[PDB]
Write a protein that binds this DNA or RNA. Structure first.
Ligand code: MG
Ligand code: MG
Ligand code: MG
Ligand code: MG
Ligand code: MG
Ligand code: MG
Ligand code: MG
Ligand code: MG
Ligand code: MG
Ligand code: MG
Ligand code: MG
Ligand code: MG
Ligand code: MG
Ligand code: MG
Ligand code: MG
Ligand code: MG
Ligand code: MG
Ligand code: MG
Ligand code: MG
Ligand code: MG
Ligand code: MG
Ligand code: MG
Ligand code: MG
Ligand code: MG
Ligand code: MG
Ligand code: MG
Ligand code: MG
Ligand code: MG
Ligand code: MG
Ligand code: MG
Ligand code: MG
Ligand code: MG
Ligand code: MG
Ligand code: MG
Ligand code: MG
Ligand code: MG
Ligand code: MG
Ligand code: MG
Ligand code: MG
Ligand code: MG
Ligand code: MG
Ligand code: MG
Ligand code: MG
Ligand code: MG
Ligand code: MG
Ligand code: MG
Ligand code: MG
Ligand code: MG
Ligand code: MG
Ligand code: MG
Ligand code: MG
Ligand code: MG
Ligand code: MG
Ligand code: MG
Ligand code: MG
Ligand code: MG
Ligand code: MG
Ligand code: MG
Ligand code: MG
Ligand code: MG
Ligand code: MG
Ligand code: MG
Ligand code: MG
Ligand code: MG
Ligand code: MG
Ligand code: MG
Ligand code: MG
Ligand code: MG
Ligand code: MG
Ligand code: MG
Ligand code: MG
Ligand code: MG
Ligand code: MG
Ligand code: MG
Ligand code: MG
Ligand code: MG
Ligand code: MG
Ligand code: MG
Ligand code: MG
Ligand code: MG
Ligand code: MG
Ligand code: MG
Ligand code: MG
Ligand code: MG
Ligand code: MG
Ligand code: MG
Ligand code: MG
Ligand code: MG
Ligand code: MG
Ligand code: MG
Ligand code: MG
Ligand code: MG
Ligand code: MG
Ligand code: MG
Ligand code: MG
Ligand code: MG
Ligand code: MG
Ligand code: MG
Ligand code: MG
Ligand code: MG
Ligand code: MG
Ligand code: MG
Ligand code: MG
Ligand code: MG
Ligand code: MG
Ligand code: MG
Ligand code: MG
Ligand code: MG
Ligand code: MG
Ligand code: MG
Ligand code: MG
Ligand code: MG
Ligand code: MG
Ligand code: MG
Ligand code: MG
Ligand code: MG
Ligand code: MG
Ligand code: MG
Ligand code: MG
Ligand code: MG
Ligand code: MG
Ligand code: MG
Ligand code: MG
Ligand code: MG
Ligand code: MG
Ligand code: MG
Ligand code: MG
Ligand code: MG
Ligand code: MG
Ligand code: MG
Ligand code: MG
Ligand code: MG
Ligand code: MG
Ligand code: MG
Ligand code: MG
Ligand code: MG
Ligand code: MG
Ligand code: MG
Ligand code: MG
Ligand code: MG
Ligand code: MG
Ligand code: MG
Ligand code: MG
Ligand code: MG
Ligand code: MG
Ligand code: MG
Ligand code: MG
Ligand code: MG
Ligand code: MG
Ligand code: MG
Ligand code: MG
Ligand code: MG
Ligand code: MG
Ligand code: MG
Ligand code: MG
Ligand code: MG
Ligand code: MG
Ligand code: MG
Ligand code: MG
Ligand code: MG
Ligand code: MG
Ligand code: MG
Ligand code: MG
Ligand code: MG
Ligand code: MG
Ligand code: MG
Ligand code: MG
Ligand code: MG
Ligand code: MG
Ligand code: MG
Ligand code: MG
Ligand code: MG
Ligand code: MG
Ligand code: MG
Ligand code: MG
Ligand code: MG
Ligand code: MG
Ligand code: MG
Ligand code: MG
Ligand code: MG
Ligand code: MG
Ligand code: MG
Ligand code: MG
Ligand code: MG
Ligand code: MG
Ligand code: MG
Ligand code: MG
Ligand code: MG
Ligand code: MG
Ligand code: MG
Ligand code: MG
Ligand code: MG
Ligand code: MG
Ligand code: MG
Ligand code: MG
Ligand code: MG
Ligand code: MG
Ligand code: MG
Ligand code: MG
Ligand code: MG
Ligand code: MG
Ligand code: MG
Ligand code: MG
Ligand code: MG
Ligand code: MG
Ligand code: MG
Ligand code: MG
Ligand code: MG
Ligand code: MG
Ligand code: MG
Ligand code: MG
Ligand code: MG
Ligand code: MG
Ligand code: MG
Ligand code: MG
Ligand code: MG
Ligand code: MG
Ligand code: MG
Ligand code: MG
Ligand code: MG
Ligand code: MG
Ligand code: MG
Ligand code: MG
Ligand code: MG
Ligand code: MG
Ligand code: MG
Ligand code: MG
Ligand code: MG
Ligand code: MG
Ligand code: MG
Ligand code: MG
Ligand code: MG
Ligand code: MG
Ligand code: MG
Ligand code: MG
Ligand code: MG
Ligand code: MG
Ligand code: MG
Ligand code: MG
Ligand code: MG
Ligand code: MG
Ligand code: MG
Ligand code: MG
Ligand code: MG
Ligand code: MG
Ligand code: MG
Ligand code: MG
Ligand code: MG
Ligand code: MG
Ligand code: MG
Ligand code: MG
Ligand code: MG
Ligand code: MG
Ligand code: MG
Ligand code: MG
Ligand code: MG
Ligand code: MG
Ligand code: MG
Ligand code: MG
Ligand code: MG
Ligand code: MG
Ligand code: MG
Ligand code: MG
Ligand code: MG
Ligand code: MG
Lengths: 275, 48
RNA sequence: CCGAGGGUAGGGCCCGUGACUGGGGCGAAGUCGUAACAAGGUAGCUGUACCGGAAGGUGCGGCUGGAU
RNA sequence: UGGGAGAGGGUGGUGGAAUUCCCGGAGUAGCGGUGAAAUGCGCAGAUACCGGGAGGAACGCCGAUGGCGAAGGCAGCCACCUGGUCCACCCGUGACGCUGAGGCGCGAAAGCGUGGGGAGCAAACCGGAUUAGAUACCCGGGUAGUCCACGCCCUAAACG
RNA sequence: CGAUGUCGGCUCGUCGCAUCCUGGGGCUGAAGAAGGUCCCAAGGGUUGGGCUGUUCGCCCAUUAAAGCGGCACGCGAGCUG
RNA sequence: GAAUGCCGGCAUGAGUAACGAUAAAGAGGGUGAGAAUCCCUCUCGCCGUAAGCCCAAGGGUUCCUACGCAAUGGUCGUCAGCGUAGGGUUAGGCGGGACCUAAGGUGAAGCCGAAAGGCGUAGCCGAAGGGCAGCCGGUUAAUAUUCCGGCCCUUCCCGCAGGUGCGAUGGGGGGACGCUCUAGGCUAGGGGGACCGGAGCCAUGGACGAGCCCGGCCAGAAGCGCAGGGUGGGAGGUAGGCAAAUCCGCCUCCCAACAAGCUCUGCGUGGUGGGGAAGCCCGGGUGACAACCCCCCGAAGCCAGGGAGCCAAGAAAAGCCUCUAAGCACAACCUGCGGGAACCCGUACCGCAAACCGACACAGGUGGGCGGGUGCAAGAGCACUCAGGCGCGCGGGAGAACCCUCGCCAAGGAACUCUGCAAGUUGGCCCCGUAACUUCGGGAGAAGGGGUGCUCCCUGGGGUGAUGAGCCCCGGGGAGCCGCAGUGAACAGGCUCUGGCGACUGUUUACCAAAAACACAGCUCUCUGCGAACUCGUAAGAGGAGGUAUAGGGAGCGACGCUUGCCCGGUGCCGGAAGGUCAAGGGGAGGGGUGCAAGCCCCGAACCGAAGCCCCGGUGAACGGCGGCCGUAACUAUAACGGUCCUAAGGUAGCGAAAUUCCUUGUCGGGUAAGUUCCGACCUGCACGAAAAGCGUAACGACCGGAGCGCUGUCUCGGCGAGGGACCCGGUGAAAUUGAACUGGCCGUGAAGAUGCGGCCUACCCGUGGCAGGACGAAAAGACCCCGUGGAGCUUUACUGCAGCC
RNA sequence: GAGCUAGCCCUGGCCAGGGUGAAGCUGGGGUGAGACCCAGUGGAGGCCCGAACCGGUGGGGGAUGCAAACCCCUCGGAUGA
C-alpha cells in the first residue's frame, strides 16, 4: 500500500514510499549482520567497471539462509519481519526450536508466529522449502536453487515467483519470473509461495536526491558527450544517432542478442522469455 | 587562492621515501641513478 | 469626532466595441457524391469510440420504432 | 412462527467441449476464401489425421411464450457469505402509513488511470477484391479494446 | 601576413562645394503672395524624439534649414563593444 | 656586425612609475655619532564571532638575554623574525608507541603471468575512530596537567589475607553506532543587588548619597544529597553457537516488574589547598584578616548507551564480563591491604599568519575549540565597546587638470543607451488587506496601506519563587509630550503586466560562456536465467552482487496533461533444419619428375565440407523517409471534386514570418505622438511536426525578449564638495623599449601614406605640467587566408591491419 | 606524478537565528458503517528569509597588479544531489 504525500514541495508531488506495515522489528539481529563493503563500482584494480555507482546510504548486510536444506525437519517460528536494505524483498527472522536463528526472504502472506520447516516431507504451506520433486505441479514457488545444494538463485526479488509446470525425468519445469520455461533439477530446493512486498514496483522515487540515496549517481547520455567518449558523441546542435544506437564501447544496443551461443545451459532452456 | 603545494609529512614519506622506492623496479632504478650521479640526497628529506 | 467629496490602490457585475475565428439561419433554377424513406439495394435507430472530402463508415453494447 | 421457488448479489474453488499456439508422430500438393476471384498460407512439408502440452475466454443440451432483481442486469458445477420475495398459521405491535423538492447509493456498452492478462474476436490501421471512385459493404492480416483487481466516467431506443 | 585592429556609435574637430538654409542675381508658362530653373556665394547655421547593432531609411513633432561628400568607410596607445 | 643568436658587462627610459589596503595620528621625555621611524609617558584613532585567546597541520630555533648595524627591512633605524655569542623545551596520568581494528596496503596457504611482476582467505600493517590512569594553584628572562605545592589515580612485580573450579588468540555477551525533533535535572557562561569587602573621589551649576568607581570566587578524596544511564530473578528441558560449556540461544514454569535491587556516570556538598580588584606607590609592593553572600537569565555542553518520529535502515576489533578445553587444582584466578617497579619519542617559538601554501615581511588560500556587554523582534547579523591586540616599515607640504572611491543638486524624469548598464527607489517588525491562474500546495512579502519614539496611569497571561514580593519573558487599554523626521544611527525586497526557453532543487567550460547546455524523477526500446549480460585485466582475479527479471547492463526521451500518424523497397537488428556461394580438411577421376625395378616424390577433376554473405520473412520510442503537373462550382476569386505521372510511402493531430521565414520591416490588428523589436492574428511553412518527441502547462529561474508604475546625475547639462592619488620638497628607486639621430609644416616625389628626397614655408637654446593625431608607435616570427607531397584530434559503406566476437 | 584538480572508499567535524506549518494523533461534528469536515496537537520538506560556510550573477576597479584570476558593491545556495 504505497504511501503518497501532499504536494508541499515540488518533489513531494510524486514521491511515494513503502508503507512498511508488514515490518514488526526495527533493528536487526546483531549476530546476523556484517559490514557491507561499498565498492563505488570499482574493481580490485581501483578502476570503475560499472559506471554511475556510489555515495548511497550506509548499509549493514543481513546474512540470509539460501540453503534451508541446512536444517531439514527442524521446525522454526516466524519471530519478526524486518526491513532489509540490501534487497527489494523483506526478510523474516526465524527462531528454530533448535535455538538457532536465521533470516530468510519473507514470502507473501507469511505471518509472525506461524511455523515453517524444510525437507522432503514438509507440508505444502507458504514458508516451507522442499526439493522441487516433492512440490506438486502448479505450485507457485520462490527462492529456487538452480543446481542442487548450490543455493537459491531464482525468484528472489520482491513480488516474484516461479511456477512448477511439470516434471520430466529428474527435472521439473519452471516458469521463471521472466516467462522463460526451464528445466531445473528435481533435488533443487524451493520455498512455497511468492516473494512478498509486491507493491515495490509502484514506488515513485520522486526526485534526484532519492536515486543518490540508493547509491545511484547520474547517468550521462552518450548523445551528450563528444566522439572521444562515445559513438553518439558530437555534432553541431542536437543530433540523432546517425548510426545504429550503440553502447559507450561500440556494440549495438537495440536488439543485438548477447547470450553466448554454445553455452551448455541451452540444453535445459525450453523456451526463451517473451512479452 | 589554494596553491598546489600542501605539504604533508606522511604523504611525502609514503610517496617518495626510501622504502617506497625500494618496493618497485622503477624506484630501484631511481635510487641507482641518483647514486651513480652522486646525489647527496637519494630521497626527499622529511621529518617523520 | 463625524462629514459632501476629492485622491491612491485593488476587486466585482453589466453594456458597447475588436484583427481574426466558430458554427447557425435564410436565399427560383451552382459543384461532389447518394446517407435515409421499399429488405432504399449493407434493416434502421441508438450511447460511446476511432477513422474519413462530404453525407457517413466500422467496433462494442442496446432498441424494434425492422422486414421477409 | 413454519415452510418455498429462483441465471438475485459478493468471495473462493473447479469441470468438460471448442479455437489458437507449441512438441512428437504419420502423410503429400495443395489449403484457404468468394458472387467469382485475389491477397494470404504451403515441398523450408501447409491443409486433412493421431498423441502430448501451454494459455485465455465463453459456458452446448437442459432452456422455455421460463425464472430472479428497483433498475442497469443476472446462465457450467461446487461450497461459504448475503439481499429481495411468496405462501400458510391468525400468534405479537396498535395507524407505527403513502409519496418524496434537495441529499445519498446503484447504474449496459464504450471510454479513462495504475497494475495484470491476451486464446478467440476486433475500432484504428495494412493488403486483396468491387467500383467512375470505394477513405465502405465482401476477403486476408491486425493494434487498442474485449478479460481480472482497484479507482474514475454516469451516458443510452437506461423502453412497457 | 617577425600584425597597417576590422562595422556602427560617442567625443572632438577640420576641409571640399556638385549649396539644405540665410545673402546677391538672370530667365520664368514671374499679376501679387508662393514656387520652378539656372548663375554667384562655403561667413555662419543645419533641432529633439520612436524603430533597428545598424550605416541608411521610415515614422512623430518641429524648423530658416533639417545639405551631400573627404579626412586609413577621420578619430579603439581617446571611450564604447 | 647582424642568426627576436649565446654568456657577461654596462647603458636608455629617469631622479620618472612605485614604496603593497584611506584603521590616523600629535606631543613631551630618554638613548645615541646620527632618531618622523627604537624606548618611556600622556593625548588621538582602529579591531573586538577579531585584527583577541587556545588546539591541529606545516615551519624548524625564528623562542629568552647580551653585544651589534655591512647586507636583508620597499624610507630611516640606536630597532628587528637580521649578524655573533650564551641560555632555554623536564610527564606512569597530555599526545603517539610497548593496545584495537577501518578503507586501504601487505600477505604463510594458494592462483596467474615471456622476465620484471599481477592476484590472494587467514594473519600482519594501517587512525583525527575504539580503548586507556590528573585537577587547581605557584615558580622562570625563557618550560610546565611535565618542576614545585596540595589533594587524587593507573598498570606491572612480590608478599600477606580472605574468597573461588582456576584456566583461552577458542564459545557467548558487550563494545555497537543513522537522520530530524526533543523531556527532566544540571553545569559552563552571563545580568542585577538598597547586601558583603575596598584605595579613594565630591570636580564646573547641583549631589556626602540606598553616591561614584572596584571586586564578591576556583580546585577538591571517601561519605551524603539531587538528577540520570545500564541491568529482570529462580527452576526444569535442550538436539543450536563447527570440541567442551553451569555461558549464550530456544521452550516451559514460578516470583519480581511505571518500581525495587544492584551497578555506573553527571552535578551539588565536602577534609583541605588556593586565588583575590580598582586605586595608590615603585613586572613588584600595598589594598587585605580583602569580601567571597543573595536574586535572576541559561545553553548547541553534561547526566547519555536518555525519549519520540521517520526511511534512505545507519563500521570493525580489542579492552571488559561470562563460559568452559587442554592443563593444573602445593598451582591459578577473584577481592582487600602492604612494599617495590613504571621505558621510548614529542613538548621551545610562529600558527587566518612578517615564522604555514602563494619567488616577496605578497589586500589571496589555510581544519577544530573559546569568542564578553548594551541596544536593534531574534542571531555568530549590525553599531558601539571589555579583556586583549593594533594604527597596516617612507615621510613633509600643496589644495591644478585628470583618475579613483564618496556626498548633494534647481526644473524635467529614461529624453541616456544595444540595454534603466550604472545608480536611485523599496527596505526590519506589528496590524489591515491582497487579483488572473492553479497540479489546490501555491501564486504571496502578490499588490496596496496604517503603525513604530518618549512620559504618566490602569491592566492580562507565562517562567522563577511560596500561592507573595522581587527578578524575568511576551503583552493589553487609556491620557499625554517633543522634533522636519521615532526599525530618528548601522544592518534589512523596488513593484506590476506579458511573451520565448527549461517542469522543478541541483550541475558545468579552475582562470573570457552558468545558459535554452548537463543532470534530474518519470516514459519507452533492448540485452541478461546467473560461472548473467556488461566492464577492467595477457591471465589469475575482480567489479556486476554476497544482487537474481519488482533484478542488473546499454540507448533515447526528459515533471505533469493530452497525444505520438503513414512507409519495412535500402541499412541495422531478429527469425528462417531448404536452396545458392563458401576455407582448411576429406576424397583421388586423371596426370607428371626420377629410378633397371621395388619404389620415392609432385600436381590434381568430380564429390563431401562451418560461420559469413546471398536468398525468404519480421521489426520504428531501430538508421531513416514521409511527391509532381494539369483541369474543375451560374459575378469574380478560390477549388470540396476530377485526370495523369511517380513513389517503399507521399507529413496525420497539433503548431506556424517561429531560438526555425530567404523575399521581410510579409499582411492585418494591439500597444506608442511615432514601434525593423514586442504581443495577437492570417498561412504560398525558402527550410515546423509528433520520444534528435508534437502541442500545452501551475510553480520555479542572478536565463533571453516587450511594456507600464515608482524613482533617479542615465540624460537635457552640467555645477559644487570630500578623501586617496596626480603636483612640490626630503629618503629609496624600477620597467617594457631602444640601428644611430643634430628627429618641423605644406605640396609633390619615392616600393604606391616621408622628420630623413625636391621645391617652398616656418623655426632662438633647454625644460615642467598636460592631450593623444603621427613616428604605418609597443607587445606577440597573423591564431583569418593560402602554401608545406608539415603535424595532430575527430568521422566513415576510404585503404590496410589489430583486439574482440562467430 | 591524484600534497592541484576529478570521482570514489574509510573515519570524524560543521550548518547563528527567524518563518511556513505535511502526515499522524486527539477531540468535536458526520453516517447504518463510512468517506469526510472542523479545531487543537504535531513538526514534515533536494520548503522560505538570512549569517557562518560553499558560491561567482551584474557592474566598477585593477591590467610592468596587493594578486600569473585579486579588490569593492551587488547577487546564488545555505537539512542537502
Ligand atoms: Mg505524493
Ligand atoms: Mg492535494
Ligand atoms: Mg513491509
Ligand atoms: Mg559482531
Ligand atoms: Mg584488494
Ligand atoms: Mg557501466
Ligand atoms: Mg561507478
Ligand atoms: Mg536488488
Ligand atoms: Mg526490504
Ligand atoms: Mg538444474
Ligand atoms: Mg516501475
Ligand atoms: Mg542505499
Ligand atoms: Mg535511472
Ligand atoms: Mg541522462
Ligand atoms: Mg554531445
Ligand atoms: Mg557537447
Ligand atoms: Mg579520454
Ligand atoms: Mg577514435
Ligand atoms: Mg568513435
Ligand atoms: Mg552522432
Ligand atoms: Mg551534439
Ligand atoms: Mg541542426
Ligand atoms: Mg552539442
Ligand atoms: Mg542521420
Ligand atoms: Mg552503431
Ligand atoms: Mg529467457
Ligand atoms: Mg583549488
Ligand atoms: Mg591538501
Ligand atoms: Mg602528516
Ligand atoms: Mg598525517
Ligand atoms: Mg597522507
Ligand atoms: Mg603508494
Ligand atoms: Mg616510503
Ligand atoms: Mg626487477
Ligand atoms: Mg641537490
Ligand atoms: Mg655527502
Ligand atoms: Mg628519490
Ligand atoms: Mg472638493
Ligand atoms: Mg446505411
Ligand atoms: Mg439509399
Ligand atoms: Mg438502408
Ligand atoms: Mg447502396
Ligand atoms: Mg473504416
Ligand atoms: Mg437494455
Ligand atoms: Mg524437398
Ligand atoms: Mg511451395
Ligand atoms: Mg499464452
Ligand atoms: Mg393476532
Ligand atoms: Mg457505468
Ligand atoms: Mg466496460
Ligand atoms: Mg472499374
Ligand atoms: Mg425493451
Ligand atoms: Mg597583414
Ligand atoms: Mg617586430
Ligand atoms: Mg607587432
Ligand atoms: Mg551619448
Ligand atoms: Mg513674386
Ligand atoms: Mg500667379
Ligand atoms: Mg557657407
Ligand atoms: Mg537608424
Ligand atoms: Mg559604413
Ligand atoms: Mg535599413
Ligand atoms: Mg561624410
Ligand atoms: Mg580622399
Ligand atoms: Mg570605401
Ligand atoms: Mg567598405
Ligand atoms: Mg574608428
Ligand atoms: Mg580598445
Ligand atoms: Mg573604433
Ligand atoms: Mg593604437
Ligand atoms: Mg596608434
Ligand atoms: Mg558581443
Ligand atoms: Mg654579415
Ligand atoms: Mg631581444
Ligand atoms: Mg638564433
Ligand atoms: Mg649579437
Ligand atoms: Mg644571450
Ligand atoms: Mg662576470
Ligand atoms: Mg646581458
Ligand atoms: Mg648592470
Ligand atoms: Mg639606467
Ligand atoms: Mg637615471
Ligand atoms: Mg623631479
Ligand atoms: Mg616621462
Ligand atoms: Mg610602477
Ligand atoms: Mg606598485
Ligand atoms: Mg579596506
Ligand atoms: Mg610623532
Ligand atoms: Mg628614527
Ligand atoms: Mg637615525
Ligand atoms: Mg610610523
Ligand atoms: Mg616605544
Ligand atoms: Mg596629553
Ligand atoms: Mg561582541
Ligand atoms: Mg620555510
Ligand atoms: Mg642594517
Ligand atoms: Mg643602516
Ligand atoms: Mg660587522
Ligand atoms: Mg635593505
Ligand atoms: Mg635600509
Ligand atoms: Mg618590501
Ligand atoms: Mg647607538
Ligand atoms: Mg627559550
Ligand atoms: Mg607526573
Ligand atoms: Mg617492555
Ligand atoms: Mg592489528
Ligand atoms: Mg601501513
Ligand atoms: Mg588512537
Ligand atoms: Mg592517555
Ligand atoms: Mg584529577
Ligand atoms: Mg600553570
Ligand atoms: Mg571458571
Ligand atoms: Mg548494537
Ligand atoms: Mg551495529
Ligand atoms: Mg564509531
Ligand atoms: Mg532519513
Ligand atoms: Mg563547575
Ligand atoms: Mg545575560
Ligand atoms: Mg559644586
Ligand atoms: Mg558616605
Ligand atoms: Mg546441550
Ligand atoms: Mg594581589
Ligand atoms: Mg597582607
Ligand atoms: Mg554544536
Ligand atoms: Mg547542530
Ligand atoms: Mg551522548
Ligand atoms: Mg536514544
Ligand atoms: Mg574486520
Ligand atoms: Mg597441588
Ligand atoms: Mg572469583
Ligand atoms: Mg622497550
Ligand atoms: Mg624523549
Ligand atoms: Mg612546553
Ligand atoms: Mg584569511
Ligand atoms: Mg582558526
Ligand atoms: Mg607574527
Ligand atoms: Mg608555486
Ligand atoms: Mg609590511
Ligand atoms: Mg598576507
Ligand atoms: Mg562582562
Ligand atoms: Mg533585529
Ligand atoms: Mg597607517
Ligand atoms: Mg588592516
Ligand atoms: Mg604603509
Ligand atoms: Mg599642488
Ligand atoms: Mg575606501
Ligand atoms: Mg546621504
Ligand atoms: Mg543638504
Ligand atoms: Mg535633480
Ligand atoms: Mg517616470
Ligand atoms: Mg515622475
Ligand atoms: Mg526604455
Ligand atoms: Mg546586456
Ligand atoms: Mg538605495
Ligand atoms: Mg534599510
Ligand atoms: Mg489581476
Ligand atoms: Mg487570489
Ligand atoms: Mg499575472
Ligand atoms: Mg497563467
Ligand atoms: Mg488556490
Ligand atoms: Mg507589504
Ligand atoms: Mg508600510
Ligand atoms: Mg499605534
Ligand atoms: Mg526623545
Ligand atoms: Mg512639534
Ligand atoms: Mg529582503
Ligand atoms: Mg537548462
Ligand atoms: Mg532549469
Ligand atoms: Mg519544455
Ligand atoms: Mg513541463
Ligand atoms: Mg537549494
Ligand atoms: Mg570560465
Ligand atoms: Mg577556458
Ligand atoms: Mg585557464
Ligand atoms: Mg566573468
Ligand atoms: Mg555558455
Ligand atoms: Mg544560474
Ligand atoms: Mg553542461
Ligand atoms: Mg528538467
Ligand atoms: Mg514523461
Ligand atoms: Mg516500461
Ligand atoms: Mg577488456
Ligand atoms: Mg603476456
Ligand atoms: Mg562486492
Ligand atoms: Mg560480493
Ligand atoms: Mg536532459
Ligand atoms: Mg534532451
Ligand atoms: Mg523535466
Ligand atoms: Mg492542464
Ligand atoms: Mg524501411
Ligand atoms: Mg522487410
Ligand atoms: Mg528492413
Ligand atoms: Mg554455410
Ligand atoms: Mg537521412
Ligand atoms: Mg530512407
Ligand atoms: Mg491522428
Ligand atoms: Mg507564418
Ligand atoms: Mg512557433
Ligand atoms: Mg524553417
Ligand atoms: Mg523574415
Ligand atoms: Mg531578414
Ligand atoms: Mg512594419
Ligand atoms: Mg497600432
Ligand atoms: Mg502567406
Ligand atoms: Mg532521432
Ligand atoms: Mg532538432
Ligand atoms: Mg510549446
Ligand atoms: Mg510554462
Ligand atoms: Mg508556466
Ligand atoms: Mg533557473
Ligand atoms: Mg538562471
Ligand atoms: Mg527590455
Ligand atoms: Mg520598462
Ligand atoms: Mg516607463
Ligand atoms: Mg555625472
Ligand atoms: Mg580632493
Ligand atoms: Mg618647488
Ligand atoms: Mg633622493
Ligand atoms: Mg634602499
Ligand atoms: Mg646616426
Ligand atoms: Mg647625430
Ligand atoms: Mg627634436
Ligand atoms: Mg620640430
Ligand atoms: Mg600610386
Ligand atoms: Mg607624401
Ligand atoms: Mg621636416
Ligand atoms: Mg640628409
Ligand atoms: Mg636626391
Ligand atoms: Mg629635404
Ligand atoms: Mg626640401
Ligand atoms: Mg609653413
Ligand atoms: Mg617634474
Ligand atoms: Mg608631463
Ligand atoms: Mg600620439
Ligand atoms: Mg591615440
Ligand atoms: Mg599613432
Ligand atoms: Mg611597420
Ligand atoms: Mg599607428
Ligand atoms: Mg600580447
Ligand atoms: Mg619561430
Ligand atoms: Mg609568420
Ligand atoms: Mg601565419
Ligand atoms: Mg602567433
Ligand atoms: Mg585560438
Ligand atoms: Mg590568402
Ligand atoms: Mg600529395
Ligand atoms: Mg610538393
Ligand atoms: Mg600533412
Ligand atoms: Mg595520428
Ligand atoms: Mg595484435
Ligand atoms: Mg560482446
Ligand atoms: Mg587532493
Ligand atoms: Mg596536503
Ligand atoms: Mg545550513
Ligand atoms: Mg512570516
Ligand atoms: Mg499550528
Ligand atoms: Mg505523534
Ligand atoms: Mg532550503
Ligand atoms: Mg519568508
Ligand atoms: Mg550593479
Ligand atoms: Mg589579469
Ligand atoms: Mg573580492
Ligand atoms: Mg559586498
Ligand atoms: Mg537563502
Ligand atoms: Mg538554515
Amino acid at each position: 500500500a504505497v504511501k503518497k504525500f501532499k504536494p508541499y514541495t515540488p518533489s513531494r508531488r510524486f514521491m511515494t514510499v513503502a508503507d512498511f506495515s508488514e515490518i514488526t522489528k526495527t533493528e536487526p539481529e546483531k549476530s546476523l549482520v556484517k559490514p557491507l563493503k561499498k565498492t563505488g563500482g570499482r574493481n580490485n584494480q581501483g578502476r570503475i567497471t560499472v559506471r554511475f555507482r556510489g555515495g548511497g546510504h550506509k548499509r549493514l548486510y543481513r546474512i540470509i539462509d539460501f540453503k534451508r536444506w541446512d536444517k531439514v525437519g527442524i521446525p522454526a517460528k516466524v519471530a519478526a519481519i524486518e526491513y532489509d536494505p540490501n534487497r527489494s524483498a523483506r526478510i523474516a527472522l526465524l527462531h528454530y526450536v533448535d535455538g538457532e536463528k536465521r533470516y530468510i526472504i519473507a514470502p507473501d502472506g507469511l505471518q509472525v508466529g506461524q511455523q515453517v520447516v524444510a525437507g522432503p516431507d514438509a507440508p505444502i504451506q507458504v514458508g516451507n522449502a522442499l526439493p522441487l520433486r516433492f512440490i506438486p505441479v502448479g505450485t507457485v514457488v520462490h527462492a529456487v536453487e538452480l543446481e542442487p545444494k548450490k543455493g537459491a538463485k531464482l525468484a528472489r526479488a520482491a513480488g516474484t515467483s516461479a511456477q512448477i509446470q511439470g516434471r520430466e525425468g529428474d527435472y521439473v519445469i519452471l516458469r521463471l519470473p521472466s516467462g522463460e520455461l526451464r528445466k531445473v533439477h528435481g533435488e533443487c530446493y524451493a520455498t512455497v509461495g511468492a516473494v512478498g512486498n509486491a507493491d515495490h514496483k509502484n514506488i515513485v522515487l520522486g526526485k534526484a536526491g532519492r536515486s543518490r540515496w540508493l547509491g545511484r549517481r547520474p547517468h550521462v547520455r552518450g548523445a551528450a558527450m563528444n566522439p572521444v567518449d562515445h559513438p553518439h558523441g558530437g555534432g553541431e546542435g542536437r543530433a540523432p544517432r546517425g548510426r545504429p544506437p550503440a553502447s559507450p564501447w561500440g556494440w549495438q544496443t537495440k536488439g543485438l542478442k548477447t547470450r553466448k551461443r554454445r553455452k551448455p545451459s541451452s540444453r535445459f532452456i525450453i523456451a526463451r522469455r517473451k512479452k | 587562492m589554494k596553491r598546489t603545494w600542501q605539504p604533508n609529512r606522511r604523504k611525502r614519506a609514503k610517496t617518495h621515501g626510501f622504502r617506497a622506492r625500494m618496493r618497485t623496479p622503477g624506484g630501484r632504478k631511481v635510487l641507482k641513478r641518483r647514486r651513480q650521479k652522486g646525489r647527496w640526497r637519494l630521497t626527499p628529506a622529511v621529518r617523520k
